[PDB]
């Protein structure tokens, strides 16, 4: 389960598949991208977002890694996500894996 | 870096 971003390289997200999540056969998809990205984007206690720290590095290095970050469904089922990209050649290629 | 905003979202979630 799981789901694509690619952003620009000012941070933007350009576009998203969701073709895994769609093949999923559950309810609830587009709730969960919305979310997962939102706590993909929000600050970390004091420490930036893990967006910003992945955005950072991955500029730097052409890689960055997300530990396991949790987020809450509209019927508080409770989920986490974890984010991987890549600098490809200009683009950034991240993918969210859902731990169910 | 700027987070996107839900008009945003349904712009890509569209396309």
Known sequence: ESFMTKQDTTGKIISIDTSSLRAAGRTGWEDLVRKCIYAFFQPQGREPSYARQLFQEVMTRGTASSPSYRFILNDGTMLSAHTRCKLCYPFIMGIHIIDR | ?15
């Open chain 2, 1 to 15: 870096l700027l987070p996107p905003t839900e008009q945003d979202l349904t712009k890509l979630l569209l396309e």
